[PDB]
Design a protein around this ligand. Structure first.
Ligand SMILES: O=c1ccn([C@@H]2O[C@H](COP(=O)(O)OP(=O)(O)O)[C@@H](O)[C@H]2O)c(=O)[nH]1
Ligand SMILES: O=c1ccn([C@@H]2O[C@H](COP(=O)(O)OP(=O)(O)O)[C@@H](O)[C@H]2O)c(=O)[nH]1
Ligand SMILES: O=c1ccn([C@@H]2O[C@H](COP(=O)(O)OP(=O)(O)O)[C@@H](O)[C@H]2O)c(=O)[nH]1
Ligand SMILES: O=c1ccn([C@@H]2O[C@H](COP(=O)(O)OP(=O)(O)O)[C@@H](O)[C@H]2O)c(=O)[nH]1
Ligand SMILES: [Mg+2]
Ligand SMILES: [Mg+2]
Lengths: 458, 447, 454, 468
């Protein structure tokens, strides 16, 4: 078989992440996983480090401080990330950072080209690598190259906040396949090309033909359930169950990102306690929130605001034996988290914007079907398009969020089971295999032809 | 001929000032029409009836609002939810259910007062985001008259509008109008996109009604502005600026101190130019006229504090003993004085982050001397950017591009400056304020 | 033939009541001040109710009166400066004039109730001008003043622009009483070193003679201990006991004031947990901090800063069954607090400046002598001058505070008993009776001295 | 000729002047000490301002004629703990009565001690038995103690340029007792003012550490210390000549032409929170609000170069001041009038003198200042035929000497605004009476008195004290 070449920013089953999504395809084809090893080095690396683990080969590379600052911390995380989440107020464009972004893409692309074989299928992942296919084409690479964006793709009126948006869209048309999480994301990309006169489910633009499609990432719901049962007796689980002592449990797990709406989430739980005082002392909200991107200033500000809200809300409602919001910056093993979800009565997942959000899907998959919890889900998560059994909320409406918490906490068993079974059927109908197998098959349908009109499958 | 009924948040009167009055007065004068709305005053108890004053041929019907009305209608939902979201600032949005209910209550209270004054054939023209529910309230009172709406600010695309929690109800309210008018095509498509892509409707057919959806970009009177700029060129404030500039080039800005206007990005870009081209230090002056706005809204206090700090930091960095780099003034000036400032300047610097149209951009072009015209540096997120192809268009999130555009504007040769001004001037004469007024009134007479 | 005691204070009913009531009962005296109600128009005369032997003469205030008594000069200039916070002082001339005007209005209302031999006892910084206002109405009675908060040294006092007029006002009192010796010497230093007057412990200044003295306020330690036992079985006490589940308890009770050093306190406990990780999950810090002066911008700033620190620290160290800092904005009945103190192993009292701090004294008095807790106390509290059994700390040194917490938590029974008996003997040697009896006796000596040629 | 006639003066300070900064027209410690260094063939020892990647083995020794400069670099860790940390984040705020800005850290204090000991070890190898050692300012409180532990028996004098706070404030510094103990290792502890030396004596007497006796000598920590005040002055007649000589330089003409007849209020300050710049700006605003006829007729020029930018407290006060400049100018500016001309650039000191002379008012209102020489420099720059008015904070040490100044409490904005208006309206005769009174003070305590008096004490105290 042709090798599958996976390219992502950071090269790695219990831990989720990209590895569990792509590993079987790498193992099947004897493929390669190429990318950055997370290290900073003082001088650029001459060649990639090649480690072979059975059938899969790992090719990693270091980055300089200047690379890290301009490619990752800068343009990716201070321009693309805030804009793609509809936060133009947090965007900071810098010309030298953007040039560093392009330079790193080219450096990575030339390093990969030296490892390529003519029949390799190339699968590039996420916003760090928008230019990667374009860079490969300029090196003469004719292989099929597919792209998958894990985060939202903003509508044109928001994308334009990124100053090189036009060049970025041209770069994306170097991919034979541009995959997105949801239909809305793909429509945003198509709307940009059509409504700006750039081109006309195939897109014809910038002298190429592009397949534009949605491949919403799912999970392995049956494995998650087994893991949640297997870990139900670990010490952290007994610790939390002893602490609740019969109180109902609202559970959240989020990177401490401004995309996750943690402040709105905290204030809405406060609003529910004030409006339904009989809940005071009878429910506990646990928020596990490991820090992320601490070296980006926007993340320091959102973290300080959340800490103040935790202190203010807890000072307002705490009793001598009750902390209303248990806020923890510690990271927990993924299997423990599933057992936390199963124990809980409510999953509270209210991002202001999210490509998909797997926590929402993992929350449903952890539940006991005989006594399942309720998912309260922001309508701005990509997962809202599938999880119809969730209570959908608008996170800018704190009163609506508070009512949904109260409804979730008091919901009779029968409706909890109906909503859970509806959501569970969705997870089984679109598990992680569908994302992998469908994208891999679409890549296998592209021909490595010189005529642009011959590449496309059908 | 049926009289035109103008409905807006504030009721004005002279043509030397701008505002809605200059846009609607001649149609009110032509039709013997009525201007209905709030008199700007706050009352302790709600008024039973509107105050009716007739100034020649036009009738003014005014009413006061209570403190609670003010807090929830004007300060609340309108200015704390609609204004930030419609300007793509989801971080500044604060939705409150009680404020939104008060927004609806005030609209209905105004609507019940208007219905008692109406005639069966009156043409009703409603203006701007404070009054999205107004047509709906009138239909529920049995009003069958033609009712048109014109939105002065942008209409956000569906992914941004959804930040407003009662977004579906508001779009339903907008379909009560026979005409949904917007500044630009992009605004009209965002409204169409919501209805079509959410399966509400299919002219638009939605909520059991038929709605004409169109764009009517507001213009100006470029020949009148040019004349005023010449007539006021010798007023004392104009001489003060001229003598003080003393050969330095002049960059002019006039903006409400709104977070929509990009004042911080604008200041930092001028700093960036001075840092990158040190020869300009002492040779150019940036005048920013920025009267305060909505001072009782906390988000407006924060942007003001941030802008004052930047003025102090930047002037402290580059000022010399006879040179203040950025002259920052919180004063309001007579509109005719502004035209004389615009004409005197070499660059108009108008870089909003989001703006429904921006008439300052159009007024700036119209003031210039065609024998020696200034250059317009204009943000691509202003509605005016769709018409003023002669401007140097910039993305305000790119400080380097803004600084390069300023430097390019300040040095642009006469021949290229004249070509750009003539391109923009022709557009202004093609779509002057008459076109906006006559076309909306003509469409209303067709309902 | 016993003269009435007239008590003048902010509000007429622990607290000030327990300190002065026995003297009011003994003399058939009067307590004068504000009744807690607001009026649309000024009250003509005070409302006079007689409760057995004590008369309560109370007055309403208008919104303008209330504003310039509490909100203005007293709390925006005097309070921050006397607590060494020159950065928080906001002097305003009209506020200061309103401060004098309100004192004069209260004084004119009180003068009409006075008998020529009444003994007048004025309390705290809202009422510095009160004696002056009375003298200008012709009042010759003995008038004593007691300042409950610190008196700053002349270099800090001068931050208050009318510092000279205010000290002249204090010399209208026959007695200027302070919490500690350092406070009275700061007042003496201003008068002596600025050439205003001379000593002879009597001060001769502004043509008057003023007795300058310290009267440190105490408690009733034996009453506090009995109350702690009597309330040891209430539901809130059992709630806390059960929730601790063997964990050690560090207790704090403070108004949310910037003088209380709450931010430094939280960070020192954070530093202690960081440097001694085995304490994580084995000790809990309870901070009861009811809000105070919430409509004042300076107090909102410290409150926001403290909440953020609570959230940051708990986020750093909490476990799924352990909240490191239990921060509560609730107020508790005073008798419940004594039971909380008694249950705890450490009392944590770290003001950056405090006139006395009675919580520190209440904490010690609550303890079981068979198993007593340890007091960790800032040396900038007035109580530090008496409570030598405490672990004294400088709150600007977080490491010292963290070390003292650790030492308090591990201290053997013998040393805890030695330190506790030292603090208890002090409390019994200077209980609240001493403050009352000494000041009243001094007031009776001004009146006696007037009966005889000096 | 094997023998040296005069004992060398060894000046020890945090920063040793080099290059342009040795010139008399620059100011600083150099103009205070150079004549004694030249007279005695002395040495100036201390840090060269540089950061080195590894500690220096020995000092760099440069000779300028008769004077030797012996300097050393500091490591980043040394700099962070000695200079940025304990000196500038603990001592400086506390000694200026800002307990709210003070931040103690044990590791920083240890590095402060370590750096003092390292510097003392390097100096000890250069000393001769009769050298007179003159140590300067709060960075070096421990220096004499470290030298005594190396066996140094020389006369060592200390002069504090900043205030010494009273005991209730000094105690905010956690190692206060140790630091006072260290200060008693000096044969002389010199201060700016009587209030400063009394605060030091108050600490020792009221804490039972020692007693005062035999006229001005303190007996504490087993030593005898002369405690005295030596208020620093200026060269008023040299300042006058510089102000006239530079009256035609381009920056001066630029300012003159831009004012165009408007009155000029002049301030020069490092951007320190001790200098009261926010209160100063807001009081000028209050004057403009209360006296609108002044709008457009007077300009406030504030030259405020940045200082200690890597200390967070300095970043915050700067941000607050920038916001105030922007807000006040937005409120009152006209199209040809900037009310507050706020400049962060540094100017040649002689240019500053020509600015002071041109102005009508010197506006010098620190919340706390050891002395403040700008206030004295302002007086000296004036033309006696038409002199400007000094508006001066009572919390500057110079307030005790400049009796012709208008004294203000900067915590009272209304008084400061009134003083500005009073200064702007003052008739010539009273301006001259006040100016001549201040000028005579400057001439009768010029910079020579500070130097000759301290050097005289160094030449005699330790020896006179050895008499039984
Ligand atoms: O302490 C944590 C936090 C998160 N996760 C995992 O990290 C992923 C988070 O992905 P999601 O789509 O929810 O959001 P993202 O973090 O990618 O924005 C999920 O698989 C979580 O199970 C985890 O294992 N431990
Ligand atoms: O001191 C001022 C400030 C503004 N304007 C006028 O206010 C309008 C500003 O409208 P624009 O469309 O530019 O933006 P908006 O202020 O309506 O958001 C223009 O007609 C300006 O001439 C004025 O006359 N004087
Ligand atoms: O919720 C509370 C808080 C405080 N106190 C009491 O209030 C006093 C606190 O006074 P302290 O002298 O300690 O400081 P102050 O608050 O007067 O500055 C003590 O008697 C406490 O027991 C109380 O009864 N309940
Ligand atoms: O830009 C400036 C600022 C200050 N100075 C000089 O620096 C000293 C300031 O000392 P002062 O005692 O007034 O205060 P300090 O800065 O020492 O605290 C004076 O000699 C001023 O002439 C200077 O030459 N240029
Ligand atoms: Mg105990
Ligand atoms: Mg002068």
């Amino acid at each position: 078989m042709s090798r599958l070449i996976v390219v992502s920013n950071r090269v790695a089953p219990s831990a989720g992440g990209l590895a569990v999504g792509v590993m079987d395809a790498l193992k099947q084809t004897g493929g390669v996983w190429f990318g950055w090893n997370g290290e900073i080095v003082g001088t650029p690396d001459a060649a990639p480090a090649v480690r072979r683990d059975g059938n899969v080969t790992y090719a990693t590379l270091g980055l300089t401080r200047r690379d890290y600052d301009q490619y990752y911390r800068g343009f990716s995380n201070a321009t693309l990330w805030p804009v793609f989440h509809y936060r133009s107020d947090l965007a900071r464009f810098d010309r030298q950072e953007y040039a560093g972004y392009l330079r790193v893409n080219a450096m990575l692309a030339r390093q990969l080209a030296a490892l390529l074989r003519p029949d390799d299928l190339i699968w590039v992942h996420d916003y760090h690598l928008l230019p990667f296919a374009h860079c490969l084409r300029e090196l003469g690479v004719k292989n099929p190259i597919g792209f998958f964006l894990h985060i939202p793709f903003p509508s044109p009126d928001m994308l334009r906040v990124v100053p090189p948006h036009d060049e970025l869209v041209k770069f994306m048309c170097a991919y034979d396949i541009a995959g997105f999480q949801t239909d809305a994301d793909k429509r945003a990309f198509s709307d940009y090309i059509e409504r700006r006169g750039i081109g006309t489910g195939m897109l014809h633009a910038h002298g190429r033909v592009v397949k534009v499609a949605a491949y919403p990432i799912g999970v392995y719901p049956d494995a998650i359930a087994e893991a949640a049962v297997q870990y139900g007796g670990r010490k952290p689980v007994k610790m939390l169950r002893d602490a609740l002592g019969g109180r109902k449990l609202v559970m959240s797990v989020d990177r401490l990102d401004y995309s996750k709406g943690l402040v709105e989430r905290f204030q809405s739980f406060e609003r529910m306690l004030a409006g339904a005082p009989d809940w005071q002392g009878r429910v506990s909200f646990v928020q596990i929130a490991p820090p992320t991107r601490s070296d980006v200033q926007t993340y320091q500000r959102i973290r300080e605001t959340l800490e103040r809200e935790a202190g203010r809300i807890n000072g307002r409602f705490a009793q001598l034996d009750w902390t209303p919001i248990q806020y923890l910056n510690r990271k927990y093993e993924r299997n423990l988290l599933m057992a936390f979800f199963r124990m809980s009565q409510v999953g509270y997942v209210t991002p202001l914007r999210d490509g998909m959000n797997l926590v929402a899907k993992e929350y449903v998959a952890s539940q006991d079907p005989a006594d399942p919890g309720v998912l309260v889900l922001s309508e701005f998560a990509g997962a809202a398009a599938e999880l119809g059994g969730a209570l959908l909320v608008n996170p800018y409406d704190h009163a609506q969020m508070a009512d949904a918490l109260a409804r979730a906490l008091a919901m009779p068993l029968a409706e909890r089971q109906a909503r859970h079974e509806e959501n569970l059927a969705q997870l089984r109908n679109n598990d992680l295999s569908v994302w992998r197998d469908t994208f891999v098959a679409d890549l296998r349908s592209v021909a490595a032809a010189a005529s642009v009109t011959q590449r496309a499958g059908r």
